[PDB]
Amino acid sequence: AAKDVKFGNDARVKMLRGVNVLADAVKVTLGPKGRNVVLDKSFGAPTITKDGVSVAREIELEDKFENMGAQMVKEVASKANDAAGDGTTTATVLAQAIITEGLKAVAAGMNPMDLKRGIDKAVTAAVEELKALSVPCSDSKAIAQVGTISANSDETVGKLIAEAMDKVGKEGVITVEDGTGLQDELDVVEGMQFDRGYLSPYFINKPETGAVELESPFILLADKKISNIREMLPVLEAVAKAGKPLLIIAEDVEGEALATLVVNTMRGIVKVAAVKAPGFGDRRKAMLQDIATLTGGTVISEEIGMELEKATLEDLGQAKRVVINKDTTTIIDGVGEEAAIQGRVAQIRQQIEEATSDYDREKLQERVAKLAGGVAVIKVGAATEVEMKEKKARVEDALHATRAAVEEGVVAGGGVALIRVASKLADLRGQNEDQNVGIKVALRAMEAPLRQIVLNCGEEPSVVANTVKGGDGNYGYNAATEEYGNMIDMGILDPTKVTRSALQYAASVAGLMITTECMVTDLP
Amino acid sequence: QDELDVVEGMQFDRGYLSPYFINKPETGAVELESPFILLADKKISNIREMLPVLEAVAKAGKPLLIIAEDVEGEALATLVVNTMRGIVKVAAVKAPGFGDRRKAMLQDIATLTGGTVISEEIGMELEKATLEDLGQAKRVVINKDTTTIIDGVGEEAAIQGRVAQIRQQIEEATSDYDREKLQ
Amino acid sequence: NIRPLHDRVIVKRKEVETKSAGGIVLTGSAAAKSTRGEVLAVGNGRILENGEVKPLDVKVGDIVIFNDGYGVKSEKIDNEEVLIMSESDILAIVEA
Amino acid sequence: NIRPLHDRVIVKRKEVETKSAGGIVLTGSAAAKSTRGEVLAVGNGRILENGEVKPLDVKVGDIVIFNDGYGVKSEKIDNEEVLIMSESDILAIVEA
Ligand SMILES: Nc1ncnc2c1ncn2[C@@H]1O[C@H](COP(=O)(O)OP(=O)(O)OP(=O)(O)O)[C@@H](O)[C@H]1O
Ligand SMILES: [K+]
Ligand SMILES: [Mg+2]
Secondary structure, X not given: OOEEEEEHXXXXXXXXXXXXXXXXXXXXXXXXXOXXXXXXXXXXXXXXXXXXXXXXXXXOOOOHHHHHHHHHHHHHHHHHHHHOOOOHHHHHHHHHHHXXXXXXXXXXXXXXXXXXXXXXXXXXXXXXHHHHHOEOOOOHHHHHHHHHHHOOOOHHHHHHXXXXXXXXXXXXXXXXXXXXXXXXXXXXXXXXXXXXXXXXXHHOXXXXXXXXXXXXXXXXXXXXXXXXXXXXXXXXXXXXXXXXXXXXXXXXXXXXXXXXXXXXXXXXXXXXXXXXXXXXXXXXXXXXXXHHHHHOOOEEOOOOOOOOOOOOOOOOEXXXXXXXXXXXXXXXXXXXXXXXXXXXXXXXXXXXHHOOOHHHHHHHHHHHHHHOOEEEEEEEOOOOHHXXXXXXXXXXXXXXXXXXXXXHOEEEOOOHHHHHHHHHOOOOOOOOHHHHHHHHHHHHHOOHHHHHHHHHOOOOHXXXXXXXXXXXXXXXXXXXXXEEEEOOOOOOEEEHHHHHHHHHHHHHHHXXXXXXXXXXXXXX | OOOOOOOOOOXXXXXXXXXXXXXXXXXXXXXXXXXXXXXXXXXXXXXXXXXXXXXXHHHHOOOEEEXXXXXXXXXXXXXXXXXXXXXXXXXXXXXXXXXXXXXXXXXXXXXXXOOOEEOOOOOOOOOOOOOOOOEEEEEEEEOOOOEEEEEEOXXXXXXXXXXXXXHHHHXXXXXXXXXXXXX | OOOOOOOEEEEEEOOOOOEOOOXXXXXXXXXXXXXEEEEEXXXXXXXXXXXXXXXXXXXXXXXXXXXXXXXXXXXXXOOEEEEEEEOOOEEEEEOO | OEEEOOOEEEEEEOOXXXXXXOOOEOOHHHOXXXXXXXXXXXXXXXXXXXXXXXXXXXXXXXXXXXXXXXXXXXXXXXXXXXXXXXXXXXXXXXXX
């Protein structure tokens, strides 16, 4: 369709207006004194949130060129959310500052591509300085502090996440879900707890608990689904001779086979319980093999070659303790070689490295947490659904920040790390004067997060920024107490990955945006 | 950062038809040294037709890679079992490409590896295939996503002749997509 | 022990060949059920129209190539699967 | 060696004709399975209603035109495919 074309200062001014609309909607949330933004949702009640990426996602402007600017700067928050899961507001603030200073420079007639090159050079040097300035975050106290800061100073969230990480461990997986109660609950399950229940209710050994409890049972792992008792009959007879209980993991047990298993269950010849295998095609086999390695068994499949009529007790897996309920099956202390478990975990890690999808990688990490380490679920407690959404967003932020902190370390929060980095980069120079000006606008933009935090507290951003710059090291301004001190000592820690990612994404988008001379869009 | 990835020689985007073919678990890939290259234009489901070829390969002892439309069912299962049992290190992969392209690429692999493609149109049958019929390569890496053939044992002059034929087709070729595929 | 009647025979099927001539392991449909089996018991003999019972050409302990079909039946003697069939189903005996 | 019972015969099928009369190579369905085969072994003879075994007209070593069908069975002796069938299936012997 017919296009509206704008050039030079007019297009840049409209782009800046759109960026400013989005950034003003977002930056009111930055910092502890930051406020909440209500996002009208077509379906459901309005969402109240203190996250830059959600506000940015909702922003869309009537003016086409302003909307272009808003979408472009919205990519910053989206990318920051995708990479680090936190820092989206700091990233939007950084992008706005870079855009404002760079557009000022363009209005001064300097070459925008050289400004972009200066910004890129300053940001590369800044990333190196952040890595140098970063300190490891391995203790639980620092992890709790990081979670508390990322949860808008909610000490409970930080301590809960620290406890969860301490329990499940490094290979452990932690997920955040809604809770029925008003209080945050931490649920940690170790070993295999795949979500498959008993195929027949009558398998329940303990009625008062409504669950099957097996003591030192054999484990049969069949890749196929069965409906006849003939093929497993040697295995059942061998188990009955042994006398120990048996657990069946298979694609499906039904009809005559299932009925025979149930009858033998009451009759007492064999304590047998059968559940469905976890997952689906091309993943069911993987989870079956992980269970086999954990329990020291072998999977019965047609592809592998073995048949169930020829299966033996040695073929069957071994575990210390088993709990079957309606929703999930739990295996405790599977009798399997440790070295095999670590080898299988290493193979799954290699596939994770090969994996390029978030869903795939999270499923493999869940498998790893099933084999070794544990899995934790944080049930967010809130009185209402709007509070539930807000608190869940904050807890997810805290979890992402804690993972980033463990991965790459911590730096002083409150925008202090960027201030120190910019101070260390005062001597950085480019190939020409325009690149030098780009470096300077990047350095000045590095002060934007601290200034916006101070502004959200109602204080004077320039005075606080000057005081912080006059300090050295980790000295900063705690916005929650309106006091100055060592950011590390007061527990205001920012993951190095979060700060670095915010700076990088804001710099890339803003540097490209300042290089624009023409804008083409549909007419109104 | 900008990354440069250069793959040399034949490396089509076909993975192993069965995960259990993996000789090296820590890498999750099959590494066959000096293996025969069986190139079948038809699909495979029964082991009877390749059985002479498998017995010959076994008697020799070198591994066998089966590039065919699809190896599944009984044939795939027996190949996998024989893979663990150690009589013959056998890996089977799907033929690269589709209609008309797949044939041509099979023939290029045959020229590179000095083998012959087993097809009904050509006339030969797999029951009558011999070791001389099978191709040869110095090394073959099979992974889940792609197959790589290193130093296929084939006459150089034949490779240049086949390349010249494809060049002629490229010259005649007008469509951008087709030209890129031949390139 | 179970002995057949008339021209029927009790034969125990041989295990399917796990490996081929060239040592290749056969699995699933490749390892088809063997048509050759040892004779466990032979019936008294077939009854002709005239009323005399003619002895069967099969003897106990000789390998027989049988024809699988409706004529053959599956029965379990002492937890061991045996086939029951007429001498007609037997094609050729395997000697030496 | 495998020898048949009653009127059955062990016959080894001839290789399909690769070329036609005019030297044209036949492939696939064109090179149909030959209905002519050499006789490897002959059964003792057919049993009549009266109880006597009548010898078979076919002898060992004579070429026979056989009728492929359900009556014939495929069996492998020493890795060589042999057909098993009744003398009825044999149509005409090929002499000279
Ligand atoms: N008490 C505090 N004093 C000073 N700075 C603080 C304090 N608490 C948090 N901050 C700082 O607030 C900054 C950002 O926090 P906030 O949650 O508002 O934004 P964000 O992480 O950039 O955005 P989002 O949650 O939308 O991804 C961090 O640099 C953090 O160090
Ligand atoms: K925020
Ligand atoms: Mg945050």
